[PDB]
């Protein structure tokens, strides 16, 4: 441990960089590369210096949780290592992150880019589920620490539900909900471009993202909230002030019914996707009840949340209430099927929220890589 390990997590919308043993990432940047379209190969910019730049074509080399172009990911990693982290790759261990359901070809090309081009002494590619579940222990009681749970991996691409039992991932029972944050901001944009005038066309996405991040929450029932909005408008209606890109003319808009119809499309995907109609309360149940029969109870007792799109207020409460409602009826049916002589034990359903929820994968990577025995796990240079 003469120098700490490096942790880099690559995503569809953001990339997180840092050193092992720290609680927070040192850099959360967008995953954008901008180039110009000799030594013209190195004339490029990454991250916040690539969102707007006049004479430079920008693009995104990660889409849907897979790599589309590798010539761009190589350069992205060069300027991750040599500009921001400022680490020589010849004397640091690396802990990268793979998407769920990754091919061996995609896993091996990363090792090629690392070993053959950077002389990395050691590399470790880790699944996201166990690292997400490891971070759950920071805000849990001392008497309960296990590697058994179900992770609802949300974010910017597609939402996964992955169960893990005793340290390993059960590959068959992984299911995808195609809803994520990008769909939520696309939905709230269409809501806002029907009622309010004063939004320039260029800054529509930025205003939608700001309204999503600042004011947004979930409600038990929709009709009561709609009634409360009209009955008493002063309490539940706020104003948002923005700065124009041209001539600095300030503008104002009112936030109304788009506050709590934004994160509702998790629980009612037919509002915004016509080809999918199954609420998330049922996908978790159907994934849990397709597993081995001896590990059904511990998975319900530990349903952790990892990802930025689970950051809304009272998100876990709806999952808890719906899952309790849909398991109680099933136990009632089973009890009535066998008369009334014996009452089964009610299943305890629980969802755990933490302070560390936006960057849980990076935190798990930092905790795993700080242990002394981590250096006995990685693949060395001679193995390749």
């Amino acid at each position: 441990g003469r120098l700490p390990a490096c942790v880099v997590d690559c995503g569809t919308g953001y990339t997180k960089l840092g050193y092992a043993g720290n609680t927070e990432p040192q850099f959360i940047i967008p995953s954008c590369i901008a180039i110009k379209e000799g030594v013209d190969d190195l004339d490029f910019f990454i991250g916040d210096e690539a969102i707007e730049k006049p004479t430079y074509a920008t693009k995104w080399p990660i889409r849907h949780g897979i790599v589309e172009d590798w010539d761009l990911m190589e350069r992205f990693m060069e300027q991750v290592i040599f500009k921001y982290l400022r680490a020589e790759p010849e004397d640091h261990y690396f802990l990268l992150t793979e998407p769920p359901l990754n091919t061996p070809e995609n896993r091996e090309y990363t090792a090629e880019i690392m070993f053959e081009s950077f002389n990395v002494p050691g590399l470790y590619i880790a699944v996201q589920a166990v690292l997400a579940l490891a971070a759950s222990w920071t805000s849990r009681q001392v008497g309960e620490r296990t590697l058994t749970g179900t992770v609802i991996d949300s974010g910017d691409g597609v939402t996964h539900v992955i169960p893990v039992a005793e340290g390993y991932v059960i590959g068959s029972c992984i299911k995808h909900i195609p809803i994520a944050g990008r769909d939520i901001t696309y939905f709230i944009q269409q809501l806002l471009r029907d009622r309010e005038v004063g939004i320039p066309p260029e800054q529509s996405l930025e205003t939608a993202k700001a309204v999503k991040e600042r004011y947004s929450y979930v409600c038990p029932d929709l009709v009561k909230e709609f009634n409360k909005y009209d009955t008493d408008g002063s309490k539940w209606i706020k104003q948002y002030t923005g700065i124009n890109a041209i001539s600095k003319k300030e503008f104002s808009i009112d936030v109304g019914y788009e506050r709590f119809l934004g994160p509702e499309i998790f629980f009612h995907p037919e509002f915004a996707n016509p080809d999918f109609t199954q609420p998330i309360s049922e996908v978790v149940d159907e994934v849990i009840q397709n597993c081995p029969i001896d590990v059904r109870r511990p998975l319900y007792k530990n349903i952790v949340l990892s990802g930025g799109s689970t950051m809304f207020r009272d998100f876990g409460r709806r999952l808890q209430r719906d899952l309790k409602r849909t398991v109680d009826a099933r136990l009632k049916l089973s009890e009535e099927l066998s008369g009334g002589r014996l009452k089964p034990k009610p299943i305890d359903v629980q969802v755990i929220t933490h302070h560390m929820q936006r960057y849980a994968v990076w935190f798990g990577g930092s905790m795993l890589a700080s242990t002394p025995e981590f250096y006995q796990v990685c693949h060395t240079k001679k193995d390749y």
Partner: peptide, 17 residues
């Protein structure tokens, strides 16, 4: 393994209706 991780952890109402 799990032992190293757990050892390194410390070192470093309107709804029922």
């Amino acid at each position: 393994p799990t032992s190293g991780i757990v050892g390194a952890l410390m070192e470093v109402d309107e709804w029922e209706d």
